[PDB]
Amino acid sequence: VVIFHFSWKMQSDVWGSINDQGVVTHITGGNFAQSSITINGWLRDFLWAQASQVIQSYGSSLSAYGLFFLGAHF
Amino acid sequence: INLPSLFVPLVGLLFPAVAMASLFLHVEKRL
Amino acid sequence: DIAGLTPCKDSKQFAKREKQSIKKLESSLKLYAPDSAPALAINATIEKTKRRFDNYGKQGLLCGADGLPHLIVSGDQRHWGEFITPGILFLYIAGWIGWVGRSYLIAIRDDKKPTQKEIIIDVPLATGLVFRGFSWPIAAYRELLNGELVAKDV
Amino acid sequence: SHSVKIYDTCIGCTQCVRACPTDVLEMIPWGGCKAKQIASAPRTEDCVGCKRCESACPTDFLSVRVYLWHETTRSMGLAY
Amino acid sequence: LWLSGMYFHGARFSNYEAWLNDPTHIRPSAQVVWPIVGQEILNGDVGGGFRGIQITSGFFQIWRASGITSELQL
Amino acid sequence: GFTPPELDPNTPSPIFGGSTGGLLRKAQVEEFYVITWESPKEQIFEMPTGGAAIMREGPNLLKLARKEQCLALGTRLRSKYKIKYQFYRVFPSGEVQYLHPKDGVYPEKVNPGRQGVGVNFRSIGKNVSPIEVKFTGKQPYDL
Amino acid sequence: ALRFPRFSQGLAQDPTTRRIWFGIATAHDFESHDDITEGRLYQNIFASHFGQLAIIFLWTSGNLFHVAWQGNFEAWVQDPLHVRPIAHAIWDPHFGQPAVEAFTRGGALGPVNIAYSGVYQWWYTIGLRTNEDLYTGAIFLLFLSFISLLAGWLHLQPKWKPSVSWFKNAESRLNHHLSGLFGVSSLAWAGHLVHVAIPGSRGEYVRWNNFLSVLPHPQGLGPLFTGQWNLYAQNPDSSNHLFSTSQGAGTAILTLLGGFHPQTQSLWLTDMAHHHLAIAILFLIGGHMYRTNFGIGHSIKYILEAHIPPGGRLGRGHKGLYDTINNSIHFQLGLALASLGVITSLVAQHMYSLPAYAFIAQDFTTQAALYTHHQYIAGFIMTGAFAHGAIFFIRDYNPEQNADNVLARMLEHKEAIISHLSWASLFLGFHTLGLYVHNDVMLAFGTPEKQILIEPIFAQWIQSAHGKTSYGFDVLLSSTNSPALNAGRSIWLPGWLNAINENSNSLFLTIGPGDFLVHHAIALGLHTTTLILVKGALDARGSKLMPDKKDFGYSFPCDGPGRGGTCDISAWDAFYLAVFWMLNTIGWVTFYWHWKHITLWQGNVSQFNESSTYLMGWLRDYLWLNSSQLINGYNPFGMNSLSVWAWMFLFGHLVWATGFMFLISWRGYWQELIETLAWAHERTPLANLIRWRDKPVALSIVQARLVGLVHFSVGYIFTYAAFLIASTSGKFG
Amino acid sequence: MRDLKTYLSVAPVASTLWFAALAGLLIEINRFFPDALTFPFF
Ligand code: CLA
Ligand code: CLA
Ligand code: CLA
Ligand code: CLA
């Protein structure tokens, strides 16, 4: 729970890309302040949303991470 | 007059109260 | 053909897959020096991929609607290379392994401290025994006929 | 109250008696072995069903058997 | 032994100097794989004329903060 | 035939500081146990419920809420130290009941005054099938 | 007695909360009750059977009444394809305004539930048209269940209770149940189909007030007795026929076409009438086998004892089996449960491929729900059959009366059976998992053509032998000069071959390598579950680790920590372990079915055909992909009608997870925690004034295994049902 | 030496050396005859 909290909060309110005006687009547009308050938000906005990267890893150089995902489930 | 308006509270609130009170009373003391 | 599949060499989806595969690797080769270590490695695997597709085409595999080489195991003689001759090879190797192990177990069963020779292998005895697996089929056949393969009394 | 039985294969080693937490078993005279002793269970109303006695029996199969049965507050080892 | 392995891999099978030239475009990676069964796909494009497995140990940052500029020092 | 020792109240009890592992309501309403030993000297011993207590030189009488706890303390007293102990069971009546050692000699030592209770004169493999005692209140082992 | 429970004295004297728990969980174990005889046992069984019948009838009439009262039936019969059927109304004071607006569907005046039981299509197929029909039906069923209760009471007094001699009369009971319970019932159903349903599917409304005024056929009952039965098929419904209209209708009442109804995509009603008539004739003729008061017929015992092979390969054959079956109730229950479970999953497999109800093939999520429901029920029934086999072997098995017959010889070579079951399951598991992992690695390295796809050529060959023409095998029924194809070419083969070679239905779907791999997963599941259950049954009477297990009962904690440790050594523990594998295998089965059909219903079968051969495909393209609407049932931007499933979906995840507690954490831990809780309560002011009456104890060992299994399975069922209904209901296709 | 020969034949070390040899053999075989879905010689 601690590392999930850290990862979501960082990808939602700190990390992201800055631009020319100083407009900061975060990895997730502050979706932690409104979606993390119910368990459906954790299952949908965190796991289901963030989980897509690893599922599509196959066929690229991050394929080993997909393989380890499935093997660890096993 | 709306029949659910009466039977859903009674069967969902009253009936379990009565039944559980009675069944506790029956199970939890010596004859 | 068999199960509605078509000879990969004459299929269109099988070719399309080959060209698509080869296409992406070529892209990886680009943006680097034309004759660099990474570029040379990418070239090598491109040639390897072309060889694999041509080898599949040559061996007469069956391709479905996805262009993937399906394997027939019904026993059709046009396809023994897919399952049955590798199966005979496997059965030979596995009988080798099992027979050598059984031979060893029987040979060490007569000492006072037989567990000593199980946690610590007698490698001289093992190397004397390994090569009987070569003839394991004949030995096992004659042991069954003799009636000494299966323990009576049990 | 659990039910403890002693069978005539008992060699009268007495290891089980020395194992029981609640003093259920005992050693009594007999004539069917070389120790002239056999295990008795005169106080099974105090047996907690721990079955330490069975793990201490060196016979095969066991000579001391504990059949768990109706529970008492003595049988359940409850201090409240 | 583990530390020496890390330093040697950073010396020999790394893109540490390329990363040192341009830190925020090159991805650090100090492990390559042998092309045996097609696993060389794991040798992804980490930039810098280098193909390997992007590492997350943060070792490049330590080596840069210590002043290590060549692979002779590693 | 070994008149059991009678419990002597006014016998002191070990020096303890108190614990939350002592007696409870069950000792008030159903029963509790009392163990006694005699202590060649004043020493420290681990309590079967909490920490450490000091047994007094002279009679020691300790009240426990479980017979198993008493036997544990008795074993520890008997083999770590070399001390002979006896324990009783007390009911809310004011009755006491000498419990152990029942006939003066420890049960690991055979005594010629004991009868056999729950002994079967056959090997455990000769119990009848449950089908043989179906619909009668008996158990195949109780036979 | 003098306390709950009274059927048990040992539990009534238990001063702990256990007495309550166990008091509930042994209420129907009549053989372990105090003062039990055989007469009491049999009479109690009879009475509770009557009670179960009453419950069933009350349940089905509740369904009918609610569909009639708060339902959608009259509107639904007008346009079965473009209106959703309503199950019942919702009244929930916890609902919010947007939820009220979101759940009001189907043209209702308030929040309602959409029915997925398929009762609308069933009742529409058999003849019900108006709400008055459903009201009469519900009233009749209330009447029937009241009479069931009355009979259950009447057969419990003296003055009417039967003797155990009566209950063991097997020949007459079989005679009646075959000829009467199965035969006359099926005959009567054929009568209803011919008199009410077939006319109802042609415009006419035959009811009680006029059915003596209507001929089912223009030449009623003439053909039947004159022998000219063909006249009852001389004019079938033309293939351009709207279901409950007379446009394109015929007059035939019995026929054998084999295809589907073109508009409804279901079986012809006249075909079902003919089928029930035929099997009624078969049951009636076959129910005159066994001997009763009339001096003719068979004696089951003699047939059993006469079937012993010379040469003695079967020992004493079936000598003594009649008495061990007739006297053992658990043997009878095991046989009944086995047959019932097999035919239950047969129902599940036949109802999706050969639909019987009109417009149910086009309601996709009704199909999915029905299939999954019946398959899970069949799995539970199979596990129960094996559990009662084990219970029989413990309680009712008599070794010396069964000397050397088939039962004893089963018991005496149990090692060979168990070892070979284990070999088969090891082989299947090793190789199925290995092929799946090989494929997964091949696709992770970006090389699709390096996969080990095996064409399911035997199943494809069988499909060819049924008439399918997509693999080009040219066998029976897809040959052209075969005797098989020529012999039925005029009766049912036209319709059959037309339906099977159509690829928009589910009759013999096209299969590929993914089907091969998943079928072998299914085979492994079956073999491992049967390994666990058979090992539990054949080892129930004792093993080498505990040779005297039989006198410990069916269910017990363990045999202490001695001899190495004997946790989960009961046969009950074997059942407990096998339920996990049953759940897992039925999960594989239903996952396979749902994905194949959900890709077929979208016209995207290549999506399955290609991504089903590696497990990342199953995870991503099936689980993660089809779960978006469900988890979006409610979000920070509002909720929709799927919210109730989105909630239940998480519910099933919670329940499942807490089932892990009772399965991982063990009794000792909890017992000591409870004892310190008891100290705390007794020691605190203003609350020690209140005293419990049973000393709180941690759950038993077996009780905890049971509770954990119940939680696990409930969570399982609920989350999968939520996902299935929400993913099919969301796309509605 | 004699005892070193003994220890080098204890079960874990014997099996790791055996499996390393087997791995080397299989690796080289598939390095010479790569991407083999069948037996194409006879
Ligand atoms: C097993 C059949 C069954 C089932 C599952 C339901 C289920 C439901 N009914 Mg219902 N009902 C039934 C039969 C059934 N009914 C019958 C036969 C009648 C008489 C024709 C009614 C008349 C009825 C009315 C008038 C209403 C409901 C309502 C409801 C819903 C609210 C829950 C409730 O208030 O309880 C049901 C309330 C009742 C008064 C039911 C009493 C009649 C049955 C026979 C009682 C049986 C009790 C029995 C002793 C226990 C059986 C054992 C077993 C079920 C555990 C609910 C979905 C309410 C609703 O519409 O929700 C929106 C509503 O107002 N029902
Ligand atoms: C994903 C979880 C999982 C897996 C993989 C298995 C797998 C297996 N179960 Mg099991 N089971 C599970 C969960 C699982 N179970 C759960 C939750 C329960 C409920 C408690 C059970 C209860 C249960 C029972 C009661 C039984 C089994 C049995 C079996 C075996 C069946 C035989 C077989 O299929 O051949 C093999 C299948 C495999 C999947 C093995 C694959 C593993 C490969 C070999 C790894 C290869 C190692 C590789 C070289 C690298 C290793 C890494 C390195 C660090 C060493 C099998 C090994 C039955 C049995 O024993 O069979 C005789 C048995 O009776 N299971
Ligand atoms: C016609 C079907 C049938 C019949 C008549 C019986 C009859 C019997 N079974 Mg049996 N059984 C069956 C099917 C059947 N079973 C099936 C299908 C299974 C597989 C699941 C089992 C597995 C089974 C086992 C393992 C055992 C029995 C036992 C028994 C005997 C005592 C049962 C009892 O009173 O316990 C009391 C009744 C209960 C404890 C039920 C209460 C708890 C249930 C399981 C929870 C219900 C789920 C939950 C409430 C619903 C979800 C909640 C909500 C959120 C939806 C009894 C003679 C027991 C026995 O004594 O053997 C001789 C025994 O141990 N059965
Ligand atoms: C012709 C005489 C006759 C008839 C009609 C019956 C009828 C019945 N007996 Mg009885 N019996 C008889 C003679 C008869 N018996 C005699 C002479 C004896 C003395 C030996 C007995 C002794 C006896 C005992 C001891 C018991 C019965 C029981 C039963 C009931 C069985 C349980 C049940 O209802 O399941 C229903 C069965 C069916 C509907 C037919 C089976 C259908 C199969 C399984 C599948 C159908 C598939 C099809 C697609 C279904 C469509 C589904 C769709 C519509 C939704 C049943 C109503 C049991 C009972 O009383 O329960 C209360 C029972 O305990 N009988």
Ligand code: CLA
């Ligand atoms: C999701 C599964 C799950 C859940 C819900 C729990 C829940 C709990 N665990 Mg547990 N645990 C689990 C898995 C789970 N565990 C597993 C898998 C293991 C194995 C490692 C353990 C091992 C474990 C240990 C060793 C211990 C616990 C303890 C506890 C309790 C902590 C005290 C507490 O939180 O109070 C609050 C209760 C909750 C937070 C549960 C949810 C409450 C719901 C949301 C309230 C709803 C009320 C509702 C209105 C009820 C009315 C409904 C009506 C129809 C009747 C708690 C009830 C500890 C304990 O006992 O505490 C003293 C303890 O020591 N757990």
Ligand SMILES: CC1=C(/C=C/C(C)=C/C=C/C(C)=C/C=C/C=C(C)/C=C/C=C(C)/C=C/C2=C(C)CCCC2(C)C)C(C)(C)CCC1
């Ligand atoms: C434990 C136990 C028990 C139980 C058991 C069981 C549970 C069993 C089962 C089983 C099962 C579950 C079985 C199944 C089966 C089936 C079968 C065996 C089948 C079949 C069939 C056939 C032969 C077919 C044929 C055909 C036809 C007819 C036509 C078409 C073609 C075909 C080929 C398909 C008891 C109590 C008894 C006793 C004790 C022990």
Ligand code: SF4
């Ligand atoms: S179960 Fe425990 S208390 Fe009872 S006799 Fe055995 S060891 Fe002693």
Ligand code: SF4
């Ligand atoms: S341990 Fe077993 S054999 Fe020895 S005395 Fe006790 S019961 Fe008898």
Ligand code: SF4
């Ligand atoms: S189930 Fe519990 S008491 Fe029984 S052997 Fe296992 S750990 Fe011990």
Ligand SMILES: [Ca+2]
């Ligand atoms: Ca079709």
